[PDB]
Amino acid sequence: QRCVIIQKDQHGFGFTVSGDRIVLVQSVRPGGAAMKVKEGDRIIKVNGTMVTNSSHLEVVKLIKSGAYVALTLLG
């Protein structure tokens, strides 16, 4: 379990969320703001609210409802 913070860029955040009950990470843009986050990381906390019981729409909303997002993964 790790805590990482990333700011938006000229090409968005720089990662892709997948899953429903267990929301996690699929690909990271090789030149985004996440590559320079690992491929295959489960998001367990987002923006203060734990996304253990969150829907995909809820996680996406949480990450997107703000300028910068700060989250807690599990690798």
Add this chain to the structure above:
Amino acid sequence: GIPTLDYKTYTDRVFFLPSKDGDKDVMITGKLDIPESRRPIVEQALYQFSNLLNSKSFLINFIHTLENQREFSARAKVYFASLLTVALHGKLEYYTDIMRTLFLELMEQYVVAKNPKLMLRRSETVVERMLSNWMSICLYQYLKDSAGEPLYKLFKAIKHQVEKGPVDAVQKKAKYTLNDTGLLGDVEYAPLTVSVIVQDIDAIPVKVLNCDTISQVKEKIIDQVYRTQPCSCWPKPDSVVLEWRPGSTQILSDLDLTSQREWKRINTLMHYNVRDGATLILSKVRVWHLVRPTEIYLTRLLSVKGTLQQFVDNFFQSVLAHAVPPAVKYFFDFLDEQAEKHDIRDEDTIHIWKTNSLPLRFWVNILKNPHFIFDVHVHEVVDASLSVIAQTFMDACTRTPSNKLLYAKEISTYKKMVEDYYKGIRQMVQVSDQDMNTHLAEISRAHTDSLNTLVALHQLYQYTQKYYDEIINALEEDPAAQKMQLAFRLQQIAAALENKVTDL
């Protein structure tokens, strides 16, 4: 001569036909639906899911974790095991390895439980269904050789004695059957013979009954018209028309304006004034039938029993006597050695073990479901009688009712055959681990490529998906699985194969 199903068809019917989402579920269908813009990645991850399943620690932890969870129906056990059989068809020695492990563990948990003679009688675990599939696999070529013969003969015989007499379409109760519960209580009828013309044009004679419903009659015709054609290609009686042309004109339908109501009565041949020698035409384009909702029963059951006695007997004499299959020898001797290592003294515990292992787990299933190996479709009426024979067959293996009344001296006669069969296998020359691994190898090499591997893999993946936490934790607990970092690998694989996706 004997219509034996292909390997893939046989296996699919044996494994998945009585599964969760029905007879046309995912795997017989191959109904994998994913976008083609994802197929490369999805396959790429499914292969790593395969390599993961090939890790022993991962597979065992997976299985244990799944067995732990209460929310796991019997369906789930059976289906899962069958998926595991299909996905691991590649290295069957590894499969057999897993089975050995789980069977040893089950055995040792059973010996110091309450009753070790209860082993392999609950079907409440995965490794039992695994063993079931193992016997099914290894005995395919034995079925296609000598086993299928008197079994097909038996089926066709029962079917003949059934269709020789009246059958009710509503309640599925026939005048001729081995089942007391499925026996029809006394309507007059007649063995009619009608002339049917098929247009695709040829004229074919067909034997039916005047009390048969129009649907039943259609079935009896189609059965003769499309014999040369597999059952999957046969048309249902609801996509075929039957006409009667007397002079210069009437259409035959199960229910019509001519139906006799008071409750509706399904139309029969004796309803349309259709007597013998008539000419019918087949063009490919509440409710009661016979009954409106004892010694005769004993007599009918006994006569039917007498007619089928020959075929039942031939079947048992081929089954319980001959060159006993290598996997049977190997597994029974494995039960011997593991019974010696597990200090179970009682011989009837081993007789019960071998009984639960081979005749119950394999022969009974086929006896009740012939349509798993033969290109036939069977109705409940025949399957019921075959089930009576299956009960009879099981009682011939128990070292301890209409199936009890019907076959009396039979069971006793067959018990000697069974005990001498097991003894024959024990006094038989040992098939080493190598010979067995080789026989498995020829199967693996011959049949994996026709098998539906990706769908199996994906279903199993869904099983890991449902219990992701418990499994990842099971892998983090086990030191070997955290050494191989199997949790991280499973996490990555899960990461790739996901459905709903969003780019942020």
